[PDB]
C-alpha cells in the first residue's frame, strides 16, 4: 500500500487491502446508487481530487 499512495491516490481512510466487494455492484445502473456506494467505502476523496 506504500506504492499506491505514491500514485497520489486518496487511500488514507480506505478500510483495507486490495479491496473486494459482494457481487451486487455488477448490476447497478444508477450513478446516485454508485456515488452513495463510493462514499460508504471511504474513497470519495479520490473523486474529489
Amino acid at each position: 500500500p506504500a506504492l499506491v499512495m505514491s500514485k497520489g491516490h486518496r487511500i488514507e481512510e480506505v478500510p483495507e487491502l486490495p479491496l473486494v466487494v459482494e457481487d451486487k455492484v455488477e448490476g447497478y445502473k444508477k450513478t446516485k446508487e454508485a456515488v452513495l456506494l463510493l462514499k460508504k467505502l471511504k474513497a470519495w476523496n479520490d473523486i474529489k481530487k
Partner: protein
C-alpha cells in the same frame, strides 16, 4: 521488504520535489522531510510522526501499529500532549526509548516537538 520498495520509489514518487540543487519530500510522517531511507514515512513496519495539534494549543503524535500493515484505516494511532515545554518532552522520550520502538529517530522527534510550540506561542 522495505528495502525492496525504496528501490522502486527513490526517484519517482508523487511526493518528490527537486530544484535549486536541493531535494525534499512531502510525505505524511517524514520528520525532516527528506527523501531518504531512515526518514521515509510509509514504507516500513513501524513509524513515528509529530504533527501540529488540532486547534492552536498542543502537539499530536503518531505511532504505527506492528500488526495489520495491510489495513490502513486502522493502522496509525493518535494522542495529544498539551503541557509544559520541558515536561511534554518527557512523554516523547519515554515513547522511543522504553518501548524499544525504532531507536534511530530519538533526536529527530525532540527537534520537531520543540519547533511546533515555538510556533503556537505568540510572535516577536
Amino acid at each position: 521488504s522495505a528495502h525492496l520498495q525504496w528501490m522502486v520509489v527513490r526517484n519517482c514518487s508523487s511526493f518528490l520535489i527537486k530544484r535549486n540543487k536541493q531535494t525534499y519530500s512531502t510525505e505524511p510522517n517524514n520528520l525532516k522531510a527528506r527523501n531518504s531511507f531512515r526518514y521515509n514515512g510509509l514504507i516500513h513496519r513501524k513509524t513515528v510522526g509529530v504533527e501540529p495539534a488540532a486547534d492552536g494549543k498542543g502537539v499530536v503524535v503518531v505511532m504505527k501499529r506492528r500488526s495489520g500493515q495491510r489495513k490502513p484505516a486502522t493502522s496509525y494511532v493518535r494522542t495529544t500532549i498539551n503541557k509544559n515545554a520541558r515536561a511534554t518532552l518527557s512523554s516523547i522520550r519515554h515513547m522511543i526509548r522504553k518501548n524499544k520502538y525504532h531507536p534511530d529517530l530519538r533526536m529527530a522527534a525532540i527537534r520537531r516537538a520543540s519547533a511546533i510550540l515555538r510556533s503556537q506561542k505568540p510572535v516577536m
